[PDB]
What we know:
Elements: E1 3-7, H1 12-26, E2 33-40, H2 45-57, E3 62-67, H3 79-90, H4 94-99, E4 105-110, H5 115-120, E5 127-131, H6 135-143, H7 177-186, E6 194-197, H8 205-212, E7 223-225, H9 241-245, E8 252-256, H10 265-278, E9 281-285, H11 289-295, H12 297-306, E10 307-310, H13 315-319, E11 324-329, H14 333-342, E12 346-348, H15 355-364, E13 368-370, H16 378-390, H17 394-410, H18 415-426
Parallel strand pairs: 1-2, 1-4, 2-3, 4-5, 5-6, 6-7, 8-9, 8-11, 9-10, 11-12, 12-13
This protein binds 5-bromouridine 5'-(tetrahydrogen triphosphate).
Residues 11-13, 16, 132, 256, 258-260, 285, 312-316, 332-335, 338 line the site of 5-bromouridine 5'-(tetrahydrogen triphosphate).
PDB class: transferase
Keywords: flavonoid C-glucosyltransferase, glycosyltransferase, C-glycosylation, transferase
Assembly: monomeric
Amino acid sequence: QPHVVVCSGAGMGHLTPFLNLASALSSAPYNCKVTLLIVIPLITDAESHHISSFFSSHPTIHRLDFHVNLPAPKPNVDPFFLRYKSISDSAHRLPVHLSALSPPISAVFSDFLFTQGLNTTLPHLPNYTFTTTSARFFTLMSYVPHLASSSSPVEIPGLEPFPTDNIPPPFFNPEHIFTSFTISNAKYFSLSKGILVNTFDSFEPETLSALNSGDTLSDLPPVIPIGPLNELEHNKQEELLPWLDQQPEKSVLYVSFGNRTAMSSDQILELGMGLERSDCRFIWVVKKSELRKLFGEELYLKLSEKGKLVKWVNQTEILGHTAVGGFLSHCGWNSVMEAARRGVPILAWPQHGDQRENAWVVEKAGLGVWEREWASGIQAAIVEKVKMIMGNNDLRKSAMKVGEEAKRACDVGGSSATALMNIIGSLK
Ligand SMILES: O=c1[nH]c(=O)n([C@@H]2O[C@H](COP(=O)(O)OP(=O)(O)OP(=O)(O)O)[C@@H](O)[C@H]2O)cc1Br
């Protein structure tokens, strides 16, 4: 009976958890009427494919497009940052757009980019901000308006200090494009009904206990873990599954630095050489002619003999496969949670944004280990650490326990399932 609107943003790291939320709410035991807002046009052609597939497989979820013009490119500015700004700038349009829906909407579950727009413009709708990052990094985000100097760590009372090394450098520049919309939106988190986080109590217990006490970041509304949100299905299974079926248990390293272009040609080459020297079986989402002459023919062949060099996979199907023994990851939060759910040990090589703090959380939780200066010697970093990640050892066991706790959290009666049920049960 309750009609809820899930308001997604731009790019897969934002899209996926919104799709997962929308799907979870549509089905039992929540049984909501769900509308899924999509910002058009989409930033890449790939997302269009995935979004269309989703609505076909969930006919009871209504699509709602929300047009926002592409901003004009700039020499200096990142194109994703420009797009986020444009979505943030558009957000004030949402209450009218959303209130024109039927039936009556009970609540909005929205991207952080829509916070200021939804929370300051009439009509006032009940808005839960759904952050797609860790509780850890979210607490830093909430503090960005209170940033002055970068001389010392940022110390939020009641939380472990944030070293300057891990804070995105833009956050110390109030007119950096990213910082500007972070501030604008974070200033109004206090007017949200709650902050939903794709995490679980036993994964981030120190952060969450501090928040739950009322003494730390007291202006925030309740911060509510609702994860790990379990994944969607698709009408095209992962192509590599029968190849994975042929490999020994826990023998394959899954390698992914996310959707966007992450590493330089020199870095890709070095990773190639390291993977070659490791003799590990692998599946590596690289971001097939480019690669042959990037690696050279000798190395490209040797890599092909042990692994799969791919442009795209169904990541959850890979991580759920018994052949996969480890995950070399940039620690985008969706990837962390997908790995947590399946108990897959992570070798964390973070690059930017929330990734370093996410990597810290991964190590603190016993899900993996963060190689802080991986990028100073890529070939050596993989050759040294992969065997510990891929071993039958203390880390494998700690990762396995995280998986058990992650499944427990979203099972009936679990910390996250209960949290989400309470939200939905309170609804109009
Ligand atoms: O081949 C692939 N298949 C695939 O299903 N994914 C899926 O993209 C999703 C989003 O990724 P993150 O959060 O891990 O990293 P990012 O850097 O791309 O996003 P941010 O959180 O930093 O914005 C995850 O749900 C993956 O499962 C990604 C890749 Br790559």
